Ligand code: HEM
């Protein structure tokens with residue numbers, strides 16, 4: 247668990263409170279209602295996978311390889327509407343005890359969330 | 368919109384990458400699989416409401432009043448399993464142009480997310 251949902255909700259509440267604050271400056275409740283309607287039913291985690299340094303999962307994956315090559319997280323919206331994040335996993339010094347220090351990354355993490363209201367897998 | 372889902376996903380990916388890192392130190396993929404299984408299908412925003420400084424929505428709400436009185440966010444797990452956050456909205460100086468500066472808070476924000484796999488409203 248690691249209490250992820252609670253931590254995610256806390257982070258999300260901070261984001262939402264920040265946006266609500268901007269909307270409140272207008273002194274118009276209608277704008278609040280429209281923000282809420284666009285947020286409801288979304289955010290559910292749809293998938294979480296791990297890939298090796300070659301872009302292969304647990305043939306290589308082009309987007310993952312590209313992500314590994316660019317050395318940056320890749321954000322891709324695609325279809326149900328969903329959002330996918332490919333995060334390269336850095337071969338930190340603590341990891342180097344079991345992963346050759348010659349590799350910048352040991353693999354990548356694929357996270358996908360739902361942008362479809364009411365859809366959670 | 369304010370691109371909330373993307374910002375939430377980015378924040379979530381940071382949380383997940385941190386946890387995955389701890390699990391990777393074990394060099395055991397089984398533990399990764401169990402974390403993923405416990406995360407899937409959760410996180411969907413179920414509700415987002417606003418309350419005034421008295422605990423009334425747009426009779427007063429006891430938990431909201433308490434939240435306003437304690438001056439701190441209240442985290443409450445309850446039932447479908449869900450997670451509710453009551454965040455008091457501080458009457459910042461920029462808000463004081465239209466809300467009497469004598470009130471510490473102008474109201475509160477209620478955010479509820481799903482802890483039920485597959486449930487998104
Ligand atoms: C971050 C700063 C602000 C916060 C936190 C805030 C918060 C709130 C909250 C919680 C409500 C709903 C409950 C209630 O009616 O008391 C509200 C209502 C309202 N606020 Fe603010 N507010 C802020 C800034 C402003 C500003 C700058 C204005 C003036 C331009 C404004 C004008 C009003 C008005 C007129 C309402 C009534 C809405 C209606 O017609 O029902 N607020 N505000």
Ligand code: HEM
Pocket residue numbers: 296297298299335336337338340341342343344345352353354388389391392393394395396
């Ligand atoms: C934050 C540090 C670490 C990261 C980012 C990391 C990441 C990864 C990744 C992405 C994989 C799956 C793909 C692959 O097999 O290459 C993996 C596999 C593995 N890692 Fe790590 N690792 C870390 C630390 C460690 C440590 C400290 C050990 C040694 C105690 C370890 C031992 C292994 C082993 C043996 C596997 C094979 C798993 C299997 O049996 O299939 N890793 N690691």
